[PDB]
Write a protein that binds this ligand. Structure first.
Ligand SMILES: Nc1ncnc2c1ncn2[C@@H]1O[C@H](COP(=O)(O)O)[C@@H](OP(=O)(O)O)[C@H]1O
Ligand SMILES: Nc1ncnc2c1ncn2[C@@H]1O[C@H](COP(=O)(O)O)[C@@H](OP(=O)(O)O)[C@H]1O
Lengths: 297, 9, 300, 9
């Protein structure tokens, strides 16, 4: 029970799951939460998404589920096992804090299940223009098993189904427990965005969430894996550079078929025919941050 | 190339 | 320490677990049935998910690069092991009735006995060993599927039985005498009383006569839970009997008979003569003879 | 789909 004021970890504890389709601002989000003295997310565990996928497998498969039932390995047992594995990884892989958090992008495919397992956890789902997420994964070569980096159409098609699932789960979990966070809104208005999020989380304001990059390497602060692909971006302050670098890099046939390939775009408020949408007006805060990044601060 | 950056399903 | 009622039994990483295993079709279900019949012990059915999580965790440490990324994420050996410990123990503790001593039987878990030993330092291991010609004949004629085994070929199945037990036996040896005991299926069948006396000693469990009466305890409180879709079930409902020791003989293709020593050098190493076709496994206790006559009489 | 009596060896 004990992580090691003495916080004890357990099924009923307050928990924050951050996720979304990779290259959707998920690391930025968790680094901003990490900056808060009362929150710790830390790096991507990688193994949590694996045990969940495993779990999601033994459910669909009839033959397998029947065998597990007849062995007394019921939902009750699997869930208890999952709970304990997850609690241990989350609780022991970084420093302790009043509010524990996990970011592993795909965990948000099982938010309904995770919410059932942890009845006081809440969920932040990152949402970013699929066209930006895909162009990111192709040009930087961030690999996802089953996405074909040689094809915009494929990656878009699989972004679409991925976020369709995650969004539906977010809706079922309910608005008290899951908040869709729009990357482009977070970049455009950090302070407005973080105000709503923390509120939603039932956690109090701290200017530190607006200065995540000053807390990199520091204690109670933000810990970054040097192998994680987002790391070189998260060291900079919230800035505007990555909003629409995708524009013009989409093959013309994919541009034509955008609404059909990615109907989730229009669902989440991205006009699939704006190249790019007008995401909004930048706060002076991120205008200034952007200006420092270009000079090299 | 024993594991990708990401996985699930 | 998780708790269950059904007095109240307390379970943790330091409790004495029994892990039974071996190559499937080696009498592993029989062995765990006999233990389930001890009132102090529950093994229960094959969980399936334990060797599955063990395979996964294996892959992660097997790749140097994946190990590095985990370490960099703070997901270190200690964190993995704690999550494993916790995962495996929930499944073992809760997949059946509670009992003073807890036991698991998933045949290939024994390829991971050094690891499980490390995770659960008072757990012990029973490696079931049976003439591979018998297990292979069994897996083939019953069509019991094992990942990577080609059931159309005795040479392939014996070649892989050989590899599986070579690894399992290397693990057993490495944890040592105090923690892993090989149990010969044929000696178990011919001599159940003496076998179970030696097995219960090794485990530091007081003798109980009910180990020799597992068939009277099927489906019963503190007794033997059987899954009706596990392939050993129709065999394990009967008392320890003799029919299955030697029936493999003569059903092995002549070329494999001939190469038996190249193909399965683990036969010799374990005390099965590869050119004895069959070996003399020995002579049965009157108890087993009577059990076998009861089976033929049709009391099951 | 790849269901077998023993899936991991
Ligand atoms: N300080 C910052 N300001 C704005 N966007 C940031 C940021 N740090 C990271 N991001 C963006 O988050 C995206 C990665 O999200 P994830 O962590 O889910 O992979 C990257 O997009 P690009 O690769 O398009 O730059 C990255 O630029
Ligand atoms: N009551 C009993 N007496 C003797 N052997 C038994 C038995 N119950 C099961 N077995 C043997 O255990 C073997 C299966 O082992 P496992 O459970 O490890 O697969 C089977 O061999 P056969 O298939 O040759 O009959 C089976 O006959």
């Amino acid at each position: 029970l004990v992580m090691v004021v003495e916080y004890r970890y357990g099924k009923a504890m307050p928990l924050i799951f951050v996720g979304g389709v990779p290259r959707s601002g998920t690391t930025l989000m968790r680094a901003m939460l990490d900056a808060h003295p009362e929150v710790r997310c830390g790096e991507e565990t990688r193994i949590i998404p694996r045990v969940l996928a495993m779990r999601q497998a033994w459910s669909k498969s009839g033959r397998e589920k029947l065998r597990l039932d007849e062995a007394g390995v019921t939902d009750e047992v699997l869930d208890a096992a999952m709970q304990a594995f997850i609690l241990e990884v989350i609780a022991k892989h970084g420093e302790p804090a009043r509010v524990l958090c996990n970011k592993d992008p795909f965990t948000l495919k099982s938010s309904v299940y995770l919410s059932r397992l942890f009845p006081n956890s809440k969920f932040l789902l990152m949402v970013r223009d699929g066209r930006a997420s895909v162009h990111s994964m192709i040009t930087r070569k961030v690999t996802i098993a089953g996405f074909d980096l040689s094809s915009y159409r494929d990656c878009l098609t699989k972004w679409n189904k991925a976020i369709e699932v995650m969004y539906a789960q977010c809706m079922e979990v309910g608005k008290e427990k899951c908040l869709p966070v729009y990357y482009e809104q977070l970049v455009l208005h950090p302070r407005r965005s973080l105000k709503l999020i923390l509120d939603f989380l039932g956690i109090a304001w701290s200017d530190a969430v607006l200065h995540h990059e000053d807390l990199i390497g520091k204690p109670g602060g933000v810990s970054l894996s040097k192998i994680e692909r987002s790391t070189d971006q998260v060291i900079k302050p919230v800035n505007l550079e990555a909003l629409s670098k995708w524009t013009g890099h989409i093959p013309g046939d994919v541009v034509r078929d955008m609404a059909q390939i990615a109907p989730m775009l229009a669902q989440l408020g991205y006009d699939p025919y704006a190249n790019p949408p007008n995401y909004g007006n930048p706060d002076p805060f991120v205008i200034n941050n952007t200006q420092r990044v270009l000079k090299g601060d | 190339e024993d594991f990708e950056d990401y996985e699930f399903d």
